[PDB]
Amino acid sequence: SMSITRLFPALLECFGIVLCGYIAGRANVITSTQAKGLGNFVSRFALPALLFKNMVVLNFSNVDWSFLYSILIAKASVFFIVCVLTLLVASPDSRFSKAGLFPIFATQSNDFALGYPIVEALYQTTYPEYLQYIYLVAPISLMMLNPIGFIFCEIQKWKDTQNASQNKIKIVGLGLLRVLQNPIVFMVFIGIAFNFILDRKVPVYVENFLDGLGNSFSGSALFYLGLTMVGKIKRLKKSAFVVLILLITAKLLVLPLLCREMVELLDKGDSVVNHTSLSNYAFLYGVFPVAPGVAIFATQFNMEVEIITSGMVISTFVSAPIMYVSAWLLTFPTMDPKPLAYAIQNVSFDISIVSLISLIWSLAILLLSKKYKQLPHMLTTNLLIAQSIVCAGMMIWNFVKEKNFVGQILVFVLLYSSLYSTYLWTGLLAISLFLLKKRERVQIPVGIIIISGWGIPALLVGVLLITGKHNGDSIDSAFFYGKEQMITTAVTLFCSILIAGISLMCMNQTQLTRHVLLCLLLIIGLFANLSSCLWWLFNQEPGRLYVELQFFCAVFNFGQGFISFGIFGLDKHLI
Amino acid sequence: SMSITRLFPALLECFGIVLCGYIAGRANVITSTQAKGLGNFVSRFALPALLFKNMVVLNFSNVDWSFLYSILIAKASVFFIVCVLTLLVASPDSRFSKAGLFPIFATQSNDFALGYPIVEALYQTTYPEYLQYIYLVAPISLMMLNPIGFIFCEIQKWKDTQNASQNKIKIVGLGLLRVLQNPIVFMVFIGIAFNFILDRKVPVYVENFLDGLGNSFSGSALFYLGLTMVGKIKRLKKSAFVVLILLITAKLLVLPLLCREMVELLDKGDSVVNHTSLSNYAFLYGVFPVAPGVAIFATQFNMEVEIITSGMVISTFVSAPIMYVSAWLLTFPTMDPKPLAYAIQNVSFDISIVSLISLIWSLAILLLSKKYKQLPHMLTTNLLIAQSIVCAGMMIWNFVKEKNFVGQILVFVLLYSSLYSTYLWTGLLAISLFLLKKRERVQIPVGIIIISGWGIPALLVGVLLITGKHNGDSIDSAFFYGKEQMITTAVTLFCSILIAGISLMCMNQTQLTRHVLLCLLLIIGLFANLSSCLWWLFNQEPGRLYVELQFFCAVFNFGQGFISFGIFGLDKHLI
Ligand SMILES: CCCCCCCC/C=C/CCCCCCCC(=O)O[C@@H](COC(=O)CCCCCCCCCCCCCCC)COP(=O)([O-])OCC[N+](C)(C)C
Ligand SMILES: CCCCCCCC/C=C/CCCCCCCC(=O)O[C@@H](COC(=O)CCCCCCCCCCCCCCC)COP(=O)([O-])OCC[N+](C)(C)C
Ligand SMILES: CCCCCCCC/C=C\CCCCCCCC(=O)O[C@@H](COC(=O)CCCCCCCCCCCCCCC)COP(=O)([O-])OCC[N+](C)(C)C
Ligand SMILES: CCCCCCCC/C=C\CCCCCCCC(=O)O[C@@H](COC(=O)CCCCCCCCCCCCCCC)COP(=O)([O-])OCC[N+](C)(C)C
Ligand SMILES: CC(C)CCC[C@@H](C)[C@H]1CC[C@H]2[C@@H]3CC=C4C[C@@H](O)CC[C@]4(C)[C@H]3CC[C@]12C
Ligand SMILES: CC(C)CCC[C@@H](C)[C@H]1CC[C@H]2[C@@H]3CC=C4C[C@@H](O)CC[C@]4(C)[C@H]3CC[C@]12C
Ligand SMILES: N[C@@H](Cc1c[nH]c2ccccc12)C(=O)O
Ligand SMILES: N[C@@H](Cc1c[nH]c2ccccc12)C(=O)O
Ligand SMILES: *[C@@H]1O[C@H](CO)[C@@H](O)[C@H](O)[C@H]1NC(C)=O
Ligand SMILES: *[C@@H]1O[C@H](CO)[C@@H](O)[C@H](O)[C@H]1NC(C)=O
Ligand SMILES: O=S(=O)(O)Oc1c[nH]c2ccccc12
Ligand SMILES: O=S(=O)(O)Oc1c[nH]c2ccccc12
């Protein structure tokens, strides 16, 4: 099935080059004007030769059409609901532009650039026929859905132009002509025509010419994608943001669920293994981020560049953890016990590397800027240090099972002392934000907060250390002392959530602009972890999904540094 | 040995993409400012990743050091002769700048962009160890010769600054520091260092990241090469051009001869087949055009941009026919009788394809511009149609020998009637140029020239048709009637050369600026062809190299259209 062992390097390449593009772009080496030439080259030269070649070589006989109808119907439904509510809710002066552009935003995946390398890694040696579906699903959806949006936007231009229903032919013709002149449709039509005309075989003189342009697309397209995100997120407003929240939730969440349910509803085959693999591939297909061409369309039309560009950037970022978590969630139910144990260990190992590097970057920038010296930033720096110790502890922990038994205990104490400190530090940060905006005079005794933040977890760790019999055969940090450590974590989370929650609601009734959000996102995370803790303790021994629960704790425990890094580290601060 | 059957497709890709870069640039799609961004990506990101990966995997045990030592000594000698004469002849105010850049121009081949794809096509399945030699010879030559040139140019900056031999350390240090900070030297040193440390194996997480950036270099470097040549050739002056003539002959001609002779002198091996292949591979390596990075160095220093940019552009075009002709001449001596026959037929077939398409473009622009209507331009248009028929005739000829015998004769008459006309049209062009610049009154009776240009070859063709017995088993146009056709060609060439030659020398003693040159290059061609004709007729039956002689006629007969297209076709003319 899924060769998920070789999925992480494919996610380290796709976003490693995007990181290189970002670093190069902000380092000011290749400015925006120079970047336009690399965009024109990639978008007008590399992509048409790749599509033309692949369309020439497709063999129209082994394609399972049920998958094709399920995805096209799902995309149509997603387009329909977004357009309907956009027409129903948007303001009268600006309604047709939104109804014409939002449904394209919520349905146009980034399939070639990111989709092809990941599908190839998982599926090249297992079930070779799945790779070819990428070049079939994308063009038909583009052909059938983009012209409608351009029709609506042209209708908006006509309405603002002080007109009527006159020349109903011409709005349709301009939309069709604008769709046809894009360097994608013409070369897809030519490739399909030459597939039948030339009888499925590329001429010898032109194969290498097509391959030279075709192979240069992936790296340069990723690099220009990274270079195009520099500084585009900008400031915002309430209503905009709430729209963005819904649009990204609609795409990433509701598209894959419809795709899987329909695939499960229409395919009727006698092969259970093929049924399972096709359903999983159908789910994984929809998670792909929004295609960068939508922002190009917005720039050319000049009417929603800020919203669409912010949407594409955030959509790209949120998609990275989702593919990993979903992939390992679908491959969990049907395997052995101990290979599952290795699965949880491997996932925790992989996540700790990225969290540690992001934390190191964010902490170094915080330290160098000398901004660590004031009132609120000091507590955040303390929080990040604790998260760093948690990640380092996990890295030291994984290589330990076959080594000195004495080393087990010190690392256990270190891990849960720092994890508890991270929990309490979130509440202390919230309380300090409560105090900072109000409360004149009576400055915060920071020494007291530091003493409480470190002494309390150590005492709790020592209490857990004394009570409990060590289980030497349990290859997991969660069951060294069994029930007693696990019960303590639930109590610790509840105290932190109440302390952090009470202060935050008081602020609303009574740099801030960002700080508050880091508290808000963390509080959402702690609630999810707490429910996982509650389910296991109350329903006997081992719940219906113990592996799923443990995987959730591992993700929310070792990935917090990435969330912190995203807000704080990638900020401009003069050295 | 050399798989030359698959060398033409490799030359249709390398220069096919370069054509796309040229067309796009003049079409104004990607202007000069935008083009700088595509250079920064290729020169600083894709290229450093390609060298670093390959240097890690090299196995320093199977490398034939005799081949390695021969090229480095050969490159040094070419560098030595150019610098010595530059100091002796250059003007005193500008002498140090030229000596620091000219030897670099004549020794820095385009090995990565153009050399590697061609060597792979010929040598991937035959002798796999030849591919690895590209990555050894290129970095060492760059490291040992370029630092010397930057030393000399810096001395000129010091000299013009009114100084002395003071701070001799800093002049040496300035040259060394500038070479090291270039994104080429630093990544070669790191790759060699990590080869021994990590024991020749790339880490799994980083292999795919390097491959994504590495494979994007080949397609994008060629495309950017075409876009940088747009409009750079410029106008010129006398003393400039004569320098350019010598510099290009030094790189392309005298460098490969030294490389082959030394390889024959130092390699002492018992394998004749390996000895033959190694000697042939050494020749083809030096024919590569001047690397585009030299013009980058000229632009940064701002001192010889006009000469060096013109040199690199002209060097690329001349290299294309040279690689093709040289490759098939080394593989001619050692084969069968009848398999050689296909070689002459195949080469003539391949050259006709490129000449026919180029002629169509050049002729079409002339007709549309309505410039065909005046006195001198009219005769050139007559000349180009005649060259077109010769190329058109060869394609019908190759396919017909196994078909209707009657079709043999009509095509035979057609080919030599037009071929003879092409010879005479060259002389008529020269005489008209003689008359145009002088001779007022008494305008040219163009009707007489049109009658003379076509009626005379037809009468000569008819005489050859009657006299001679057809040889049905001779698969070649040159021996249908044996001796009588061959004798006539020599006489026809002599009359044309004398008529064209006499007028041209009269012009010197007594648009022009370009026209004259097309006559001059053609006259050089007819002399070379005539000597080939003379050798065969006077030294019995079949010379020491009959295949070589016949091959020369085929190149100069069907490739004449290519020479004409370069001057006339690639010209700006308002439609
Ligand atoms: C995870 C381990 C496995 C995968 C590893 C694979 C590799 C992973 C590696 C990935 C790194 C990829 C690097 C690409 C380029 C980065 C730089 C960049 O463009 O910065 C942008 C920053 O943009 C933001 O600020 C976005 C913030 C989004 C946070 C979302 C958190 C939700 C996570 C939970 C999701 C659900 C959890 C799952 C639920 C099931 C643009 O910068 P700018 O425009 O200048 O604006 C910033 C500056 N300003 C803020 C001051 C204005
Ligand atoms: C041959 C068949 C097999 C191989 C096939 C492989 C593929 C073959 C395909 C090749 C096509 C390659 C396309 C690259 C881009 C072309 C466009 C371009 O850059 O134009 C440049 C033009 O440059 C010149 O004008 C140079 C003229 C050189 C002529 C040399 C003739 C010698 C040939 C004999 C050699 C020895 C013979 C052999 C002896 C043994 C730049 O243009 P510009 O800067 O605007 O300047 C022009 C305008 N202006 C003039 C008005 C100012
Ligand atoms: C294998 C694991 C991979 C994990 C990947 C995903 C996790 C990593 C993700 C994120 C962590 C890193 C984020 C950096 C992006 C921000 C850049 C930035 O702000 O620009 C700065 C400049 O730019 C520099 O100074 C460039 C620094 C390059 C070093 C990067 C090291 C980390 C790269 C990864 C290697 C890891 C090790 C891999 C091998 C062991 C600041 O710019 P400014 O203040 O706007 O002004 C510019 C100053 N100037 C104009 C004077 C020039
Ligand atoms: C397989 C054999 C391959 C052989 C390859 C090597 C031999 C062929 C080599 C050379 C022959 C062709 C040389 C053309 C280069 C000059 C272009 C030029 O000057 O630009 C012109 C514009 O540009 C155009 O209008 C673009 C025309 C594109 C069509 C090209 C067809 C030939 C390509 C090959 C396909 C062959 C068929 C292959 C398949 C059977 C003029 O520009 P301007 O006057 O400066 O102003 C611009 C006008 N504007 C600003 C209003 C826009
Ligand atoms: C869970 C799966 C199915 C869907 C993903 C939905 C959630 C996790 C996504 C959708 C919209 C996202 C938000 C969109 C916009 C921003 C603003 C940015 O400056 C910080 C991140 C933040 C606040 C994102 C956090 C994560 C987010 C809430
Ligand atoms: C014969 C092999 C080994 C070496 C190649 C040397 C000859 C063929 C080369 C070297 C220098 C070349 C010339 C250099 C510059 C120009 C100016 C350009 O506007 C037209 C072509 C023209 C006039 C070239 C014609 C071909 C040329 C004479
Ligand atoms: N414009 C702010 C909105 C915001 C930040 N923090 C908040 C807390 C509550 C409500 C809104 C916000 C943003 O996108 O970051
Ligand atoms: N500058 C001219 C020189 C030139 C053209 N034709 C000539 C004939 C003879 C002597 C010099 C020339 C050129 O490069 O094209
Ligand atoms: C999928 O195809 C068939 C069932 O349709 C069956 O051979 C098996 O389940 C799978 N085979 C391959 C080769 O994937
Ligand atoms: C070249 O290598 C040796 C001679 O050095 C001999 O086996 C033969 O000539 C060639 N072999 C191969 C494998 O190329
Ligand atoms: O089908 S698309 O995903 O839109 O392909 C693309 C079109 N334009 C692009 C620019 C950067 C990366 C990918 C691009
Ligand atoms: O080693 S080089 O040949 O100089 O590689 C290169 C460096 N810079 C380049 C720009 C275009 C094409 C090739 C290039």
Short mmCIF file of N, CA, C and O and ligand atoms in Angstrom, two decimals, chain B residues 64 126-130 269-275, ligand 10:
data_model
loop_
_atom_site.label_atom_id
_atom_site.label_comp_id
_atom_site.label_asym_id
_atom_site.label_seq_id
_atom_site.Cartn_x
_atom_site.Cartn_y
_atom_site.Cartn_z
N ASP B 64 41.36 7.72 -15.18
CA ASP B 64 42.57 7.64 -15.99
C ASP B 64 43.24 9.01 -15.94
O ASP B 64 42.78 9.96 -16.58
N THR B 126 27.97 3.17 -24.28
CA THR B 126 29.29 2.77 -24.72
C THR B 126 30.30 3.45 -23.81
O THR B 126 30.38 4.68 -23.80
N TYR B 127 31.08 2.66 -23.06
CA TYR B 127 32.14 3.18 -22.19
C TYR B 127 31.56 4.18 -21.18
O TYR B 127 31.71 5.39 -21.34
N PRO B 128 30.89 3.69 -20.13
CA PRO B 128 30.27 4.59 -19.14
C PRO B 128 31.21 5.51 -18.37
O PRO B 128 30.74 6.54 -17.86
N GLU B 129 32.50 5.19 -18.26
CA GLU B 129 33.43 6.03 -17.52
C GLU B 129 33.77 7.37 -18.17
O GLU B 129 34.42 8.19 -17.51
N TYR B 130 33.36 7.64 -19.41
CA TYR B 130 33.68 8.94 -19.99
C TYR B 130 32.83 10.08 -19.45
O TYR B 130 33.26 11.24 -19.55
N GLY B 269 48.91 2.60 -23.69
CA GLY B 269 48.10 1.46 -23.30
C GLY B 269 48.05 0.40 -24.39
O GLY B 269 48.19 0.69 -25.57
N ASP B 270 47.83 -0.85 -23.96
CA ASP B 270 47.77 -2.01 -24.84
C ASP B 270 46.43 -2.18 -25.54
O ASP B 270 46.32 -3.05 -26.42
N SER B 271 45.41 -1.40 -25.19
CA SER B 271 44.09 -1.51 -25.80
C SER B 271 43.96 -0.50 -26.93
O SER B 271 43.87 0.71 -26.68
N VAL B 272 43.95 -0.99 -28.17
CA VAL B 272 43.84 -0.11 -29.32
C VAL B 272 42.47 0.55 -29.38
O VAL B 272 42.36 1.74 -29.71
N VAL B 273 41.40 -0.21 -29.09
CA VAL B 273 40.05 0.35 -29.15
C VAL B 273 39.89 1.47 -28.12
O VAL B 273 39.32 2.53 -28.42
N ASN B 274 40.37 1.24 -26.90
CA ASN B 274 40.35 2.29 -25.88
C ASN B 274 41.24 3.46 -26.29
O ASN B 274 40.90 4.62 -26.01
N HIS B 275 42.38 3.17 -26.92
CA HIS B 275 43.27 4.23 -27.39
C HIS B 275 42.59 5.10 -28.44
O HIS B 275 42.71 6.33 -28.42
C1 LIG C 10 39.05 -0.56 -21.87
O1 LIG C 10 39.78 -1.05 -20.71
C2 LIG C 10 40.62 -2.22 -20.85
C3 LIG C 10 41.98 -1.74 -21.31
O2 LIG C 10 42.51 -0.75 -20.44
C4 LIG C 10 40.02 -3.33 -21.72
O3 LIG C 10 39.18 -4.15 -20.92
C5 LIG C 10 39.24 -2.81 -22.93
O4 LIG C 10 40.12 -2.32 -23.93
C6 LIG C 10 38.28 -1.71 -22.51
N1 LIG C 10 37.28 -2.24 -21.60
C7 LIG C 10 36.13 -1.61 -21.30
C8 LIG C 10 35.23 -2.32 -20.34
O5 LIG C 10 35.84 -0.52 -21.78
#
